């Protein structure tokens, strides 16, 4: 049963990113603040979620389905969904944009 | 997010940063454009604003009292309580502030004068409490630079009015807030507005 | 979405006309846990709805502010003050230059005569009954 688990906390997505912005430069680091909150804390359902049920934290390979983004309009995500083992990537307003097999 | 040289759209950037505008429901951000009908009494002419993600920075206002080069990122986003008082004298006729910018800054735009009572904006909240009683606007024509010692990329923005014989002398709450040029960039950060609580107009 | 920055509004956007009985919605991802005065100002300055709120951990705020062209105030022409004054530590405004429509209605009458051709010179009269007496 759930009870101690490895991926007990959660991921940080800072405000300011690792995104580089472009237009005909990709060089220069414009104020990301992701608008007004992020609401914060990527889940996901541990890889190996049967043993690390009893695992009280152990290093693991996780395979990560949401990373909460909350800016403007909607809300962004991106995550390896681990269901159909495929890479999903999301918007701001949310279309699956890729489906990555592997 | 272009993993391994795949770009992969994540939607909207502007959405992402801060500065964003949708002013009047025209959405300007990263990697827009404004171009500006300006048909005047001189004729007509069309400026073209053209809007860069990397000319991104915020833009704020910043009174008199803030030297110019001196940010203020440790002051709220929208307003800050100008508690001081300005003194008008009657041989002025403009409203002096900095607009601090620290980056090259092209973009034009302009700064809407809302000129309110402090009975017409109690001064014990920040509330304007009525739909603007006198308006009038300053295009502010940024410059990038055309040599520091000419025009400096931190201005000294000297609000002229028309109609200071429509303004006379009282204690006034005015209201200036960086807007784009009638569908012009996006604008605005720490603060976004600036807010002067117990300024006394004389003319 | 519009942000005068500190205030990302979902809702309403700068210069916008509401509907005779649409509802306002105060849609506004803002900083957590302060006190959002919106006071909704008809065009002659008075605070036809005034309410506190605060916006949550999430930000967002959702309260249905006003139900506009059915009550008295919101049935006023011209430009509304939608003025939020945010009361925090150190107090910040928001001004949003908002709209309304006017109304009124049409009844017809109609004449014929058993030659099928529509006669001129018929008085009709109208009268407001609803009274119980002929306004």
């Given at each position: 049963?759930?009870?101690?688990?490895?991926?007990?906390?959660?991921?940080?997505?800072?405000?300011?990113?690792?995104a580089?912005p472009?237009?005909?430069?990709?060089?220069?680091?414009?104020?990301?603040?992701?608008?007004?909150?992020?609401?914060?804390?990527?889940?996901?359902?541990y890889?190996?979620?049967?043993?690390?049920?009893?695992?009280?934290?152990?290093?693991?390979?996780?395979?990560?389905?949401?990373?909460?983004?909350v800016g403007?309009?909607?809300?962004?995500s991106?995550?390896?969904?681990?269901?159909?083992?495929?890479?999903?990537?999301?918007?701001?307003?949310?279309?699956?944009?890729?489906t990555?097999?592997? | 997010?272009?993993?391994?040289?795949?770009?992969?759209?994540?939607?909207?950037?502007?959405?992402?940063?801060?500065?964003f505008?949708?002013?009047?429901?025209?959405?300007?951000?990263?990697?827009?454009?404004?171009?500006?009908?300006?048909?005047?009494?001189?004729?007509?002419?069309?400026?073209?604003?053209?809007?860069?993600?990397?000319?991104?920075?915020?833009?704020?206002?910043?009174?008199?009292?803030?030297?110019?080069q001196?940010?203020?990122?440790?002051?709220?986003?929208?307003?800050?309580?100008?508690?001081?008082?300005?003194?008008?004298?009657?041989?002025?006729?403009?409203?002096?502030?900095?607009?601090?910018?620290?980056?090259?800054?092209?973009?034009?735009?302009?700064?809407?004068?809302?000129?309110?009572?402090?009975?017409?904006?109690?001064?014990?909240?920040?509330?304007?409490?009525?739909?603007?009683?006198?308006?009038?606007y300053?295009?502010?024509?940024?410059?990038?630079?055309?040599?520091?010692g000419?025009?400096?990329?931190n201005?000294?923005?000297?609000?002229?009015?028309?109609?200071?014989?429509?303004?006379?002398?009282?204690?006034?709450?005015?209201?200036?807030?960086?807007?784009?040029?009638?569908?012009?960039?996006?604008?605005?950060?720490?603060?976004?507005?600036?807010?002067?609580?117990?300024?006394?107009?004389?003319? | 979405?519009?942000?005068?920055?500190?205030?990302?509004?979902?809702?309403?956007?700068?210069?916008?006309?509401?509907?005779?009985?649409?509802?306002?919605?105060?849609?506004?991802?803002?900083?957590?846990?302060?006190?959002?005065?919106?006071y909704?100002?008809?065009?002659?300055?008075?605070?036809?709805?005034?309410?506190?709120?605060?916006?949550?951990?999430?930000?967002?705020?959702?309260?249905?502010?006003?139900?506009?062209?059915?009550?008295?105030?919101?049935?006023?022409?011209?430009?509304?003050?939608?003025?939020?004054?945010?009361?925090?530590?150190?107090?910040?405004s928001?001004?949003?230059?908002?709209?309304?429509?006017?109304?009124?209605?049409?009844?017809?009458?109609?004449?014929?005569?058993?030659?099928?051709?529509?006669?001129?010179?018929?008085?009709?009269?109208?009268?407001?009954?609803?009274?119980?007496?002929?306004?």
């Amino acid at each position: 049963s759930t009870l101690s688990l490895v991926a007990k906390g959660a991921g940080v997505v800072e405000f300011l990113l690792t995104a580089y912005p472009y237009t005909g430069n990709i060089t220069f680091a414009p104020p990301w603040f992701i608008a007004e909150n992020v609401v914060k804390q990527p889940f996901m359902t541990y890889s190996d979620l049967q043993f690390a049920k009893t695992n009280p934290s152990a290093i693991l390979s996780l395979s990560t389905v949401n990373i909460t983004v909350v800016g403007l309009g909607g809300k962004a995500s991106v995550y390896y969904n681990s269901t159909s083992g495929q890479t999903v990537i999301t918007n701001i307003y949310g279309q699956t944009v890729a489906t990555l097999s592997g | 997010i272009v993993l391994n040289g795949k770009a992969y759209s994540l939607g909207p950037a502007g959405l992402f940063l801060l500065p964003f505008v949708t002013y009047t429901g025209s959405a300007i951000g990263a990697n827009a454009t404004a171009i500006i009908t300006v048909s005047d009494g001189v004729g007509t002419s069309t400026t073209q604003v053209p809007i860069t993600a990397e000319n991104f920075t915020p833009i704020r206002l910043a009174p008199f009292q803030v030297p110019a080069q001196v940010p203020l990122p440790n002051a709220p986003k929208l307003k800050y309580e100008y508690n001081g008082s300005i003194v008008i004298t009657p041989q002025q006729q403009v409203l002096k502030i900095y607009v601090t910018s620290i980056l090259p800054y092209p973009q034009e735009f302009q700064i809407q004068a809302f000129v309110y009572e402090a009975s017409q904006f109690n001064v014990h909240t920040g509330s304007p409490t009525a739909a603007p009683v006198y308006f009038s606007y300053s295009a502010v024509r940024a410059y990038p630079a055309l040599g520091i010692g000419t025009s400096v990329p931190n201005l000294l923005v000297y609000v002229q009015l028309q109609g200071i014989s429509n303004l006379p002398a009282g204690k006034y709450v005015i209201v200036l807030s960086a807007v784009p040029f009638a569908g012009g960039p996006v604008l605005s950060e720490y603060p976004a507005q600036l807010i002067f609580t117990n300024v006394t107009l004389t003319q | 979405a519009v942000t005068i920055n500190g205030i990302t509004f979902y809702s309403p956007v700068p210069n916008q006309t509401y509907k005779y009985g649409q509802q306002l919605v105060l849609s506004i991802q803002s900083q957590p846990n302060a006190l959002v005065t919106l006071y909704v100002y008809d065009p002659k300055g008075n605070v036809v709805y005034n309410n506190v709120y605060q916006t949550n951990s999430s930000g967002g705020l959702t309260a249905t502010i006003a139900t506009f062209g059915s009550t008295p105030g919101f049935t006023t022409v011209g430009t509304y003050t939608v003025s939020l004054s945010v009361q925090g530590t150190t107090s910040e405004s928001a001004s949003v230059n908002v709209q309304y429509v006017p109304l009124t209605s049409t009844i017809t009458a109609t004449v014929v005569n058993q030659e099928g051709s529509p006669l001129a010179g018929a008085t009709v009269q109208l009268y407001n009954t609803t009274s119980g007496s002929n306004t």
